Amino acid sequence: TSDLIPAPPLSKVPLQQNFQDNQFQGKWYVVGLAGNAILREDKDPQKMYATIYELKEDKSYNVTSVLFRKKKCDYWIRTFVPGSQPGEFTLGNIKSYPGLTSYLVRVVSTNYNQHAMVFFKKVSQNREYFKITLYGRTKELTSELKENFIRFSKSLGLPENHIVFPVPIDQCIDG
Ligand SMILES: O=C(N[C@@H](CO)C(=O)O)c1cccc(O)c1O
Ligand SMILES: O=C(O)c1cccc(O)c1O
Ligand SMILES: O=C(O)c1cccc(O)c1O
Ligand code: NA
């Protein structure tokens, strides 16, 4: 059994105009996490992790997430293949992910040098998951940018306790 808030129609998820894939390269800090499978948990509040976007020759991203767990750095690697329009992506080598039938990425907004919002949607074991990452070039962002991320997360149907801001750490995500 699993109950999920439904994934929003793509109509409610903006696309960043004139997406410069080269300027989106590099390290982003996950300053905000929201989604139908994300839950606030004050026992072990979630530690901040980072995701690095590196373009290849074929303009796909090698996407490496690095995070700190069990006293070690875990490295989660996958490829984002360019999608229907610039700033939109799909997951490469989907068959290597057991249960995974669908994966969409959409860069909602960014200024490239400070902040970014990315929308993800996946269907795994037939369950439709979606999430929104508040990307920060640094570990801290303005309260306006954070409130806008709360604003946008709610516009897609998520309640407050499904919107989390991971606490900054220094292990692994530097550098
Ligand atoms: O909600 C997600 N994942 C949770 C459970 O699958 C998680 O926290 O791992 C989730 C949703 C869209 C895309 C993803 O990469 C993703 O991990
Ligand atoms: O499980 C996670 O926390 C996670 C981290 C980075 C990237 C992902 O897709 C994840 O599901
Ligand atoms: O949990 C996973 O293994 C997973 C698989 C495919 C894509 C993801 O984002 C994942 O977190
Ligand atoms: Na991420």
XYZ file of N, CA, C and O and ligand atoms in Angstrom:
740
model
N 0.840 -1.231 0.000
C 0.000 0.000 0.000
C 0.863 1.265 0.000
O 1.876 1.345 0.700
N 0.452 2.245 -0.801
C 1.124 3.536 -0.864
C 0.155 4.594 -1.398
O -0.450 4.408 -2.460
N -0.006 5.683 -0.648
C -0.866 6.793 -1.050
C -0.001 7.982 -1.443
O 0.829 8.437 -0.653
N -0.199 8.484 -2.660
C 0.596 9.589 -3.182
C -0.283 10.740 -3.645
O -1.323 10.528 -4.261
N 0.154 11.963 -3.359
C -0.450 13.146 -3.953
C -0.198 13.036 -5.460
O 0.913 12.694 -5.871
N -1.225 13.296 -6.289
C -1.038 13.067 -7.724
C -0.012 14.010 -8.353
O 0.119 15.157 -7.923
N 0.709 13.517 -9.356
C 1.659 14.342 -10.089
C 0.900 15.436 -10.829
O -0.180 15.187 -11.358
N 1.458 16.657 -10.862
C 0.757 17.751 -11.517
C 0.801 17.607 -13.030
O 1.733 16.998 -13.558
N -0.200 18.162 -13.730
C -0.094 18.203 -15.178
C 1.062 19.109 -15.588
O 1.282 20.151 -14.964
N 1.790 18.709 -16.627
C 2.928 19.486 -17.130
C 2.562 20.957 -17.387
O 3.428 21.831 -17.354
N 1.275 21.215 -17.615
C 0.776 22.571 -17.841
C 1.086 23.516 -16.680
O 1.245 24.720 -16.886
N 1.163 22.970 -15.466
C 1.445 23.766 -14.258
C 2.937 23.844 -13.893
O 3.292 24.417 -12.860
N 3.798 23.273 -14.732
C 5.240 23.288 -14.503
C 5.916 24.099 -15.612
O 6.100 23.595 -16.723
N 6.280 25.362 -15.321
C 6.929 26.192 -16.336
C 8.255 25.621 -16.839
O 8.872 24.791 -16.169
N 8.662 26.067 -18.023
C 9.963 25.745 -18.588
C 10.797 27.022 -18.634
O 10.303 28.076 -19.041
N 12.055 26.929 -18.217
C 12.971 28.061 -18.308
C 13.194 28.401 -19.777
O 13.592 27.544 -20.563
N 12.923 29.650 -20.141
C 13.079 30.100 -21.519
C 14.552 30.159 -21.893
O 15.397 30.496 -21.062
N 14.857 29.815 -23.141
C 16.200 29.989 -23.689
C 17.256 29.265 -22.851
O 18.245 29.865 -22.426
N 17.044 27.972 -22.618
C 17.894 27.215 -21.704
C 19.319 27.042 -22.221
O 19.543 26.412 -23.258
N 20.276 27.593 -21.473
C 21.696 27.450 -21.776
C 22.283 26.271 -20.996
O 22.668 26.404 -19.832
N 22.345 25.114 -21.647
C 22.826 23.892 -20.999
C 24.261 24.009 -20.484
O 24.599 23.442 -19.441
N 25.098 24.745 -21.209
C 26.477 24.984 -20.780
C 26.563 25.786 -19.480
O 27.412 25.504 -18.640
N 25.681 26.769 -19.307
C 25.660 27.580 -18.079
C 25.063 26.842 -16.877
O 25.281 27.245 -15.737
N 24.303 25.779 -17.131
C 23.717 24.971 -16.061
C 24.702 23.929 -15.522
O 24.451 23.312 -14.483
N 25.817 23.732 -16.226
C 26.859 22.809 -15.778
C 27.395 23.181 -14.401
O 27.283 24.330 -13.972
N 27.977 22.201 -13.715
C 28.649 22.436 -12.436
C 27.865 21.987 -11.220
O 26.825 21.325 -11.336
N 28.368 22.359 -10.046
C 27.797 21.896 -8.788
C 26.622 22.753 -8.334
O 26.705 23.980 -8.305
N 25.530 22.079 -7.987
C 24.370 22.712 -7.390
C 24.133 22.083 -6.019
O 24.234 20.864 -5.867
N 23.836 22.913 -5.024
C 23.446 22.422 -3.707
C 21.932 22.285 -3.633
O 21.200 23.182 -4.046
N 21.471 21.158 -3.105
C 20.049 20.943 -2.896
C 19.637 21.658 -1.612
O 19.695 21.090 -0.515
N 19.236 22.918 -1.765
C 18.835 23.749 -0.635
C 17.367 23.517 -0.259
O 16.970 23.768 0.880
N 16.571 23.032 -1.207
C 15.159 22.737 -0.954
C 14.686 21.497 -1.685
O 15.004 21.310 -2.856
N 13.937 20.645 -0.984
C 13.350 19.434 -1.566
C 11.849 19.386 -1.314
O 11.402 19.542 -0.176
N 11.083 19.151 -2.376
C 9.639 18.970 -2.270
C 9.183 17.861 -3.210
O 9.758 17.674 -4.276
N 8.153 17.124 -2.816
C 7.635 16.049 -3.650
C 6.662 15.155 -2.918
O 6.569 15.206 -1.690
N 5.942 14.329 -3.675
C 4.910 13.458 -3.103
C 5.460 12.287 -2.278
O 4.717 11.664 -1.514
N 6.753 11.997 -2.430
C 7.427 10.975 -1.620
C 8.376 11.571 -0.569
O 8.983 10.829 0.202
N 8.498 12.899 -0.537
C 9.367 13.586 0.423
C 8.580 13.994 1.667
O 7.545 14.653 1.564
N 9.086 13.611 2.835
C 8.441 13.921 4.111
C 9.425 14.537 5.104
O 10.547 14.052 5.263
N 8.982 15.603 5.767
C 9.744 16.248 6.839
C 9.881 15.286 8.019
O 8.900 14.658 8.424
N 11.091 15.172 8.565
C 11.368 14.205 9.633
C 12.411 14.737 10.618
O 13.613 14.710 10.344
N 11.943 15.195 11.777
C 12.805 15.864 12.749
C 13.609 14.912 13.641
O 14.392 15.367 14.475
N 13.412 13.605 13.476
C 14.276 12.617 14.120
C 15.665 12.728 13.490
O 16.625 13.134 14.153
N 15.755 12.381 12.207
C 16.949 12.644 11.406
C 16.577 13.581 10.262
O 16.220 13.125 9.170
N 16.628 14.902 10.520
C 16.431 15.861 9.444
C 17.448 15.607 8.353
O 18.602 15.275 8.632
N 17.007 15.757 7.117
C 17.819 15.405 5.978
C 19.007 16.340 5.808
O 18.857 17.561 5.830
N 20.183 15.749 5.620
C 21.396 16.514 5.376
C 21.448 16.951 3.922
O 20.958 16.254 3.031
N 22.038 18.116 3.692
C 22.187 18.645 2.350
C 23.110 17.747 1.535
O 24.107 17.225 2.042
N 22.744 17.555 0.274
C 23.594 16.887 -0.695
C 23.753 17.796 -1.905
O 23.069 18.815 -2.025
N 24.666 17.430 -2.792
C 24.944 18.225 -3.977
C 24.801 17.361 -5.216
O 25.000 16.148 -5.159
N 24.444 17.994 -6.328
C 24.350 17.320 -7.613
C 25.155 18.107 -8.637
O 24.953 19.311 -8.797
N 26.076 17.417 -9.310
C 26.938 18.022 -10.319
C 26.464 17.656 -11.726
O 26.323 16.480 -12.048
N 26.226 18.678 -12.550
C 25.848 18.500 -13.956
C 27.050 18.761 -14.862
O 27.584 19.870 -14.883
N 27.468 17.744 -15.611
C 28.555 17.894 -16.579
C 28.116 17.422 -17.965
O 27.761 16.257 -18.147
N 28.122 18.344 -18.929
C 27.818 18.020 -20.327
C 28.905 17.143 -20.930
O 30.076 17.278 -20.587
N 28.504 16.251 -21.832
C 29.445 15.478 -22.639
C 29.486 16.072 -24.048
O 28.913 17.135 -24.295
N 30.157 15.382 -24.970
C 30.189 15.800 -26.373
C 28.793 15.763 -26.994
O 28.417 16.669 -27.740
N 28.024 14.725 -26.664
C 26.677 14.549 -27.222
C 25.591 15.354 -26.494
O 24.399 15.101 -26.684
N 26.003 16.309 -25.657
C 25.088 17.252 -24.991
C 24.121 16.610 -23.981
O 23.137 17.233 -23.574
N 24.405 15.375 -23.576
C 23.726 14.770 -22.437
C 24.487 15.173 -21.184
O 25.659 15.545 -21.261
N 23.818 15.108 -20.037
C 24.459 15.399 -18.759
C 24.872 14.108 -18.081
O 24.072 13.177 -17.987
N 26.114 14.049 -17.611
C 26.470 13.095 -16.566
C 26.090 13.750 -15.246
O 26.631 14.800 -14.897
N 25.135 13.153 -14.541
C 24.596 13.741 -13.323
C 25.047 12.920 -12.120
O 24.609 11.784 -11.931
N 25.941 13.502 -11.323
C 26.493 12.844 -10.149
C 25.986 13.533 -8.892
O 26.294 14.703 -8.647
N 25.198 12.814 -8.102
C 24.794 13.305 -6.795
C 25.730 12.722 -5.756
O 26.016 11.525 -5.767
N 26.225 13.579 -4.873
C 27.118 13.145 -3.814
C 26.478 13.514 -2.493
O 26.050 14.650 -2.300
N 26.392 12.549 -1.588
C 25.777 12.802 -0.300
C 26.445 12.039 0.822
O 27.175 11.083 0.593
N 26.169 12.485 2.038
C 26.864 12.011 3.217
C 25.960 11.112 4.061
O 25.011 11.590 4.687
N 26.255 9.812 4.064
C 25.497 8.846 4.861
C 26.360 7.682 5.337
O 27.288 7.261 4.647
N 26.030 7.168 6.522
C 26.803 6.111 7.186
C 28.282 6.484 7.316
O 29.163 5.646 7.130
N 28.536 7.755 7.632
C 29.894 8.305 7.773
C 30.747 8.281 6.486
O 31.956 8.509 6.542
N 30.120 8.038 5.336
C 30.831 7.979 4.059
C 30.147 8.821 2.988
O 29.010 9.254 3.156
N 30.859 9.047 1.887
C 30.310 9.751 0.733
C 29.814 8.739 -0.279
O 30.590 7.913 -0.765
N 28.521 8.802 -0.587
C 27.915 7.939 -1.594
C 27.787 8.707 -2.898
O 27.376 9.864 -2.895
N 28.139 8.064 -4.008
C 28.100 8.709 -5.318
C 27.065 8.048 -6.224
O 27.242 6.908 -6.655
N 25.988 8.782 -6.497
C 24.865 8.296 -7.299
C 24.939 8.906 -8.700
O 24.773 10.117 -8.862
N 25.187 8.063 -9.703
C 25.422 8.511 -11.081
C 24.281 8.131 -12.027
O 23.798 7.000 -12.004
N 23.860 9.081 -12.860
C 22.926 8.799 -13.952
C 23.079 9.820 -15.080
O 23.759 10.830 -14.918
N 22.450 9.539 -16.219
C 22.538 10.403 -17.396
C 21.186 11.031 -17.719
O 20.165 10.339 -17.745
N 21.187 12.341 -17.961
C 20.005 13.037 -18.462
C 20.161 13.274 -19.964
O 21.047 14.012 -20.397
N 19.297 12.633 -20.748
C 19.278 12.790 -22.200
C 18.346 13.946 -22.577
O 17.214 13.996 -22.092
N 18.809 14.875 -23.443
C 17.992 16.030 -23.831
C 16.621 15.633 -24.365
O 16.519 14.710 -25.173
N 15.586 16.330 -23.909
C 14.205 15.951 -24.186
C 13.558 16.724 -25.320
O 14.238 17.214 -26.223
N 12.234 16.830 -25.254
C 11.428 17.458 -26.299
C 11.828 18.899 -26.599
O 11.753 19.338 -27.745
N 12.240 19.633 -25.569
C 12.614 21.042 -25.715
C 13.735 21.400 -24.743
O 13.923 20.702 -23.746
N 14.492 22.480 -25.031
C 15.627 22.833 -24.172
C 15.221 23.062 -22.718
O 14.236 23.755 -22.450
N 15.980 22.470 -21.797
C 15.663 22.511 -20.371
C 14.824 21.329 -19.912
O 14.468 21.238 -18.738
N 14.511 20.422 -20.837
C 13.734 19.226 -20.532
C 14.587 18.005 -20.849
O 15.326 18.006 -21.833
N 14.503 16.977 -20.006
C 15.362 15.797 -20.148
C 14.646 14.497 -19.797
O 13.628 14.497 -19.108
N 15.201 13.390 -20.286
C 14.747 12.047 -19.923
C 15.951 11.241 -19.451
O 17.092 11.635 -19.691
N 15.698 10.120 -18.778
C 16.770 9.329 -18.168
C 17.361 8.329 -19.158
O 16.632 7.544 -19.764
N 18.683 8.361 -19.314
C 19.384 7.413 -20.180
C 19.555 6.054 -19.522
O 19.685 5.964 -18.300
N 19.552 4.998 -20.339
C 19.709 3.613 -19.868
C 18.676 3.242 -18.793
O 19.015 2.729 -17.726
N 17.410 3.504 -19.103
C 16.303 3.301 -18.165
C 16.120 1.831 -17.744
O 15.661 1.556 -16.630
N 16.490 0.901 -18.627
C 16.369 -0.541 -18.359
C 17.255 -1.040 -17.215
O 16.972 -2.084 -16.625
N 18.325 -0.307 -16.912
C 19.211 -0.651 -15.798
C 18.618 -0.299 -14.429
O 19.225 -0.598 -13.401
N 17.453 0.346 -14.417
C 16.765 0.701 -13.178
C 15.530 -0.190 -12.989
O 14.506 0.029 -13.638
N 15.623 -1.207 -12.106
C 14.506 -2.144 -11.940
C 13.209 -1.468 -11.495
O 13.191 -0.764 -10.484
N 12.141 -1.688 -12.260
C 10.822 -1.148 -11.943
C 10.519 0.182 -12.606
O 9.376 0.638 -12.581
N 11.532 0.796 -13.216
C 11.412 2.151 -13.753
C 10.921 2.131 -15.201
O 11.546 1.519 -16.066
N 9.795 2.795 -15.451
C 9.185 2.851 -16.787
C 9.149 4.261 -17.395
O 8.966 4.409 -18.607
N 9.318 5.288 -16.560
C 9.247 6.677 -17.008
C 10.078 7.598 -16.113
O 10.139 7.405 -14.897
N 10.718 8.593 -16.726
C 11.495 9.592 -15.988
C 11.590 10.900 -16.773
O 12.146 10.930 -17.869
N 11.043 11.972 -16.206
C 11.067 13.293 -16.832
C 11.768 14.304 -15.928
O 11.588 14.293 -14.710
N 12.564 15.174 -16.542
C 13.186 16.292 -15.844
C 12.836 17.577 -16.576
O 12.885 17.622 -17.805
N 12.482 18.617 -15.824
C 12.208 19.930 -16.407
C 12.748 21.062 -15.544
O 12.349 21.214 -14.387
N 13.653 21.855 -16.112
C 14.222 23.002 -15.415
C 13.185 24.124 -15.387
O 12.986 24.822 -16.379
N 12.519 24.278 -14.250
C 11.445 25.258 -14.105
C 11.953 26.688 -14.261
O 11.355 27.486 -14.983
N 13.046 27.002 -13.573
C 13.661 28.324 -13.664
C 15.088 28.307 -13.129
O 15.421 27.499 -12.267
N 15.922 29.198 -13.661
C 17.260 29.424 -13.127
C 17.824 30.758 -13.597
O 17.454 31.254 -14.662
N 18.709 31.338 -12.786
C 19.566 32.434 -13.242
C 20.998 31.942 -13.492
O 21.896 32.739 -13.753
N 21.189 30.624 -13.409
C 22.461 29.952 -13.730
C 23.597 30.141 -12.714
O 24.359 29.208 -12.473
N 23.713 31.329 -12.123
C 24.854 31.640 -11.245
C 24.539 31.684 -9.742
O 25.453 31.807 -8.926
N 23.266 31.558 -9.377
C 22.870 31.558 -7.968
C 21.826 30.497 -7.634
O 22.012 29.713 -6.703
N 20.723 30.486 -8.379
C 19.586 29.634 -8.046
C 18.998 28.909 -9.250
O 19.239 29.270 -10.405
N 18.226 27.873 -8.948
C 17.543 27.091 -9.963
C 16.447 26.247 -9.328
O 16.562 25.831 -8.174
N 15.380 26.022 -10.083
C 14.337 25.084 -9.690
C 14.162 24.051 -10.778
O 14.010 24.397 -11.946
N 14.203 22.782 -10.389
C 14.067 21.690 -11.336
C 12.931 20.787 -10.893
O 12.800 20.474 -9.712
N 12.111 20.389 -11.860
C 10.980 19.506 -11.628
C 11.321 18.116 -12.162
O 11.753 17.980 -13.307
N 11.131 17.094 -11.330
C 11.351 15.707 -11.739
C 10.056 14.911 -11.626
O 9.253 15.147 -10.726
N 9.863 13.961 -12.533
C 8.720 13.049 -12.461
C 9.133 11.661 -12.914
O 9.698 11.510 -13.994
N 8.855 10.653 -12.091
C 9.165 9.272 -12.450
C 8.021 8.307 -12.147
O 7.241 8.523 -11.216
N 7.931 7.247 -12.948
C 7.016 6.146 -12.675
C 7.850 4.903 -12.368
O 8.515 4.358 -13.251
N 7.821 4.486 -11.103
C 8.575 3.330 -10.618
C 7.627 2.381 -9.894
O 6.854 2.811 -9.036
N 7.704 1.091 -10.232
C 6.724 0.094 -9.775
C 5.280 0.571 -10.002
O 4.409 0.372 -9.151
N 5.048 1.213 -11.148
C 3.739 1.787 -11.505
C 3.242 2.932 -10.610
O 2.137 3.439 -10.811
N 4.050 3.352 -9.643
C 3.681 4.450 -8.762
C 4.287 5.739 -9.308
O 5.485 5.793 -9.572
N 3.455 6.767 -9.489
C 3.903 8.023 -10.092
C 4.458 8.984 -9.037
O 3.711 9.520 -8.216
N 5.773 9.191 -9.076
C 6.457 10.098 -8.155
C 6.865 11.385 -8.857
O 7.249 11.366 -10.023
N 6.786 12.502 -8.143
C 7.354 13.755 -8.630
C 8.036 14.513 -7.497
O 7.714 14.323 -6.319
N 8.996 15.353 -7.860
C 9.678 16.179 -6.879
C 10.212 17.467 -7.488
O 10.389 17.572 -8.706
N 10.453 18.445 -6.622
C 11.007 19.726 -7.026
C 12.231 20.006 -6.162
O 12.146 19.985 -4.931
N 13.372 20.236 -6.803
C 14.596 20.581 -6.088
C 14.856 22.071 -6.218
O 14.838 22.606 -7.326
N 15.079 22.736 -5.086
C 15.562 24.112 -5.085
C 17.077 24.001 -5.155
O 17.714 23.516 -4.216
N 17.643 24.409 -6.283
C 19.081 24.344 -6.468
C 19.702 25.669 -6.065
O 19.230 26.730 -6.466
N 20.755 25.587 -5.255
C 21.522 26.752 -4.841
C 22.966 26.608 -5.275
O 23.579 25.556 -5.099
N 23.516 27.668 -5.849
C 24.916 27.656 -6.245
C 25.781 27.672 -4.985
O 26.831 27.025 -4.931
N 25.315 28.409 -3.978
C 25.835 28.311 -2.617
C 24.847 27.510 -1.761
O 23.769 27.141 -2.232
N 25.214 27.247 -0.506
C 24.374 26.456 0.401
C 23.196 27.241 0.981
O 22.227 26.643 1.449
N 23.282 28.570 0.961
C 22.208 29.428 1.464
C 21.593 30.201 0.306
O 22.294 30.580 -0.630
N 20.286 30.434 0.379
C 19.602 31.330 -0.558
C 18.734 32.325 0.207
O 18.448 32.134 1.391
N 18.315 33.388 -0.478
C 17.476 34.412 0.146
C 16.121 33.833 0.545
O 15.646 32.865 -0.052
N 15.502 34.435 1.555
C 14.205 33.975 2.051
C 13.095 34.181 1.023
O 12.086 33.474 1.046
N 13.288 35.144 0.128
C 12.378 35.353 -0.990
C 12.398 34.144 -1.924
O 11.342 33.606 -2.271
N 13.600 33.719 -2.316
C 13.767 32.569 -3.216
C 13.239 31.278 -2.593
O 12.668 30.438 -3.288
N 13.429 31.127 -1.285
C 12.905 29.973 -0.563
C 11.381 30.024 -0.460
O 10.718 29.003 -0.631
N 10.828 31.206 -0.194
C 9.366 31.378 -0.144
C 8.714 31.163 -1.514
O 7.604 30.643 -1.597
N 9.405 31.561 -2.578
C 8.938 31.290 -3.940
C 8.917 29.789 -4.256
O 8.031 29.315 -4.970
N 9.895 29.054 -3.722
C 9.959 27.595 -3.871
C 8.824 26.910 -3.103
O 8.240 25.937 -3.588
N 8.521 27.418 -1.909
C 7.349 26.971 -1.148
C 6.077 27.299 -1.930
O 5.166 26.479 -2.033
N 6.036 28.507 -2.487
C 4.914 28.962 -3.307
C 4.662 27.990 -4.457
O 3.542 27.514 -4.651
N 5.720 27.699 -5.209
C 5.622 26.847 -6.395
C 5.278 25.392 -6.047
O 4.489 24.760 -6.747
N 5.870 24.875 -4.972
C 5.590 23.512 -4.517
C 4.113 23.343 -4.174
O 3.508 22.320 -4.496
N 3.541 24.351 -3.521
C 2.121 24.340 -3.162
C 1.219 24.443 -4.388
O 0.164 23.816 -4.432
N 1.646 25.215 -5.384
C 0.901 25.354 -6.637
C 0.761 24.025 -7.384
O -0.142 23.872 -8.204
N 1.667 23.084 -7.111
C 1.606 21.734 -7.684
C 0.920 20.727 -6.749
O 0.900 19.531 -7.035
N 0.372 21.208 -5.635
C -0.473 20.392 -4.759
C 0.170 19.857 -3.490
O -0.472 19.118 -2.738
N 1.421 20.225 -3.230
C 2.143 19.687 -2.079
C 1.884 20.523 -0.825
O 1.911 21.752 -0.884
N 1.622 19.860 0.317
C 1.498 20.574 1.581
C 2.857 20.933 2.189
O 3.893 20.451 1.730
N 2.830 21.759 3.231
C 4.040 22.286 3.869
C 4.993 21.173 4.301
O 6.186 21.220 3.999
N 4.461 20.168 4.991
C 5.279 19.057 5.495
C 5.797 18.105 4.407
O 6.437 17.099 4.719
N 5.510 18.416 3.143
C 6.135 17.744 2.005
C 7.193 18.633 1.342
O 7.712 18.295 0.278
N 7.513 19.758 1.983
C 8.535 20.688 1.503
C 9.624 20.802 2.566
O 9.368 21.291 3.665
N 10.831 20.345 2.239
C 11.942 20.329 3.198
C 13.136 21.148 2.712
O 13.403 21.241 1.515
N 13.852 21.738 3.663
C 15.081 22.463 3.379
C 16.206 21.764 4.115
O 16.322 21.896 5.330
N 17.018 20.975 3.388
C 18.103 20.252 4.041
C 19.105 21.176 4.726
O 19.410 22.254 4.212
N 19.593 20.747 5.886
C 20.552 21.525 6.659
C 21.930 21.435 6.005
O 22.368 20.342 5.633
N 22.611 22.586 5.843
C 23.984 22.599 5.331
C 24.938 21.656 6.067
O 24.855 21.516 7.290
N 25.810 20.998 5.309
C 26.927 20.238 5.869
C 28.186 20.546 5.072
O 28.119 21.172 4.010
N 29.329 20.103 5.590
C 30.617 20.300 4.923
C 31.209 19.011 4.357
O 32.029 19.061 3.444
N 30.797 17.864 4.893
C 31.285 16.570 4.417
C 30.795 16.286 3.000
O 29.646 16.568 2.670
N 31.690 15.750 2.171
C 31.390 15.277 0.806
C 30.989 16.351 -0.203
O 31.520 16.379 -1.312
N 30.043 17.211 0.167
C 29.495 18.208 -0.763
C 30.438 19.399 -0.986
O 30.191 20.239 -1.852
N 31.492 19.472 -0.177
C 32.693 20.225 -0.509
C 33.798 19.181 -0.703
O 33.983 18.326 0.174
N 34.522 19.197 -1.825
C 34.297 20.100 -2.951
C 35.054 19.610 -4.176
O 35.427 20.394 -5.051
O 10.525 11.003 -4.910
C 11.519 10.508 -5.419
N 12.285 9.622 -4.773
C 12.056 9.159 -3.404
C 11.461 7.743 -3.456
O 11.561 7.158 -4.762
C 13.352 9.188 -2.638
O 13.488 10.047 -1.737
O 14.255 8.370 -2.934
C 11.886 10.901 -6.827
C 10.919 11.485 -7.646
C 11.232 11.857 -8.950
C 12.515 11.650 -9.440
C 13.484 11.073 -8.627
O 14.785 11.069 -9.031
C 13.172 10.701 -7.328
O 14.153 10.138 -6.568
O 17.290 8.985 -2.497
C 17.833 10.110 -2.583
O 17.971 10.846 -1.582
C 18.325 10.591 -3.920
C 19.465 11.394 -3.986
C 19.929 11.848 -5.217
C 19.254 11.501 -6.384
C 18.116 10.699 -6.318
O 17.456 10.361 -7.460
C 17.654 10.247 -5.089
O 16.539 9.464 -5.039
O 15.818 4.756 -5.752
C 16.400 4.455 -6.818
O 17.135 3.448 -6.903
C 16.212 5.324 -8.030
C 16.112 4.737 -9.290
C 15.939 5.534 -10.420
C 15.865 6.918 -10.289
C 15.964 7.500 -9.029
O 15.892 8.851 -8.901
C 16.137 6.706 -7.904
O 16.232 7.291 -6.676
Na 19.000 16.363 -7.482
